[PDB]
Structures are given as structure tokens and as C-alpha cells.
Curated annotation (Swiss-Prot):
PROSITE patterns: GLYCOSYL_HYDROL_F22_1 (PS00128), GLYCOSYL_HYDROL_F22_2 (PS51348). Residues 1-129 form the C-type lysozyme domain. The lineage of its organism: Eukaryota, Metazoa, Chordata, Craniata, Vertebrata. This is Lysozyme C. The active site is at 35, 52. Its main location: secreted.
Length: 129
């Protein structure tokens, strides 16, 4: 599923990501834009042989099991493939754990390099939320 910007904003808000650990909704939308282009089916191999999955590009070394990442923790206790559903529930639940790990949203490279420090509210502008 490729989400519309406001569509994703509404789904993330419904799932309680808006202001979660202090990160306003535009932060999450901005992160999803640059991680996945709002595409639930996005997958990307990392240098270390791990792969990032879904709208928030959740990694197979720590968070989900993909069956091919040596040393996998699966701290979210899910198959990585569950993170590719058109229903974002598993991705959000897992993202809540990630953002609570101590580094906040800095865990998302794309957030740190493309969203942090910018007018992230722009990402929810026009949305009926
Ligand atoms: Cl867009
Ligand atoms: Cl915002
Ligand atoms: Cl959803
Ligand atoms: Cl980046």
C-alpha cells in the first residue's frame, strides 16, 4: 500500500504516534516519507546484511525476524514480513519500542538527516486530523 500523506497522518494519529515520547505527528510523517515514500512494502538491504522493512524501515538485526540476519534479536517479536502489511499496526507498535530505546527518533537515520531541525509540521499541513 502506498499511503497518501494525510492518510498516513490519520492512521499514525489513530494509533497514538502523535506526540509519542514527545515527537509530534509531522516527525513521524516526515520519517516515513524519507524511509519508505509512504510505501508499506518497502524493503532495503543494509551494508551489514540486515534489511529494513516497511513504512518506518524497521531493521532485522534488532527488531524483527527475517530468517536471514545472523544475530537477530527480534525485540518486537514479529516476522519482518508483518511490517509490510497495508495495516500499519505492527510497524507502529514496533516503532513505539524503538523510539523508547533511549536515542528517541535518532534511531531513524533519515529522520536525523532530513527531518530533525526542520519545520516538520509542514508534513501534516492541510490534513483534516
Ligand atoms: Cl508527499
Ligand atoms: Cl507536527
Ligand atoms: Cl492502518
Ligand atoms: Cl539520510
Amino acid at each position: 500500500k502506498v499511503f497518501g500523506r494525510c492518510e498516513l497522518a490519520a492512521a499514525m494519529k489513530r494509533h497514538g504516534l502523535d506526540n509519542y515520547r514527545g515527537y509530534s505527528l509531522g516527525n513521524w510523517v516526515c520519517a516515513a516519507k524519507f524511509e519508505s515514500n509512504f510505501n508499506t512494502q518497502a524493503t532495503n538491504r543494509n551494508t551489514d546484511g540486515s534489511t529494513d522493512y516497511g513504512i518506518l524501515q524497521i531493521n532485522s538485526r534488532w527488531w524483527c525476524n527475517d530468517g536471514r540476519t545472523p544475530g537477530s534479536r527480534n525485540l518486537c517479536n514479529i516476522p519482518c514480513s508483518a511490517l509490510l502489511s497495508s495495516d500499519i499496526t505492527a510497524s507502529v507498535n514496533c516503532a513505539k519500542k524503538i523510539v523508547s530505546d533511549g536515542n528517541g527518533m535518532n534511531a531513524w537515520v533519515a529522520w536525523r538527516n532530513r527531518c530533525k531541525g526542520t519545520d516538520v509540521q509542514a508534513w501534516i499541513r492541510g490534513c483534516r486530523l
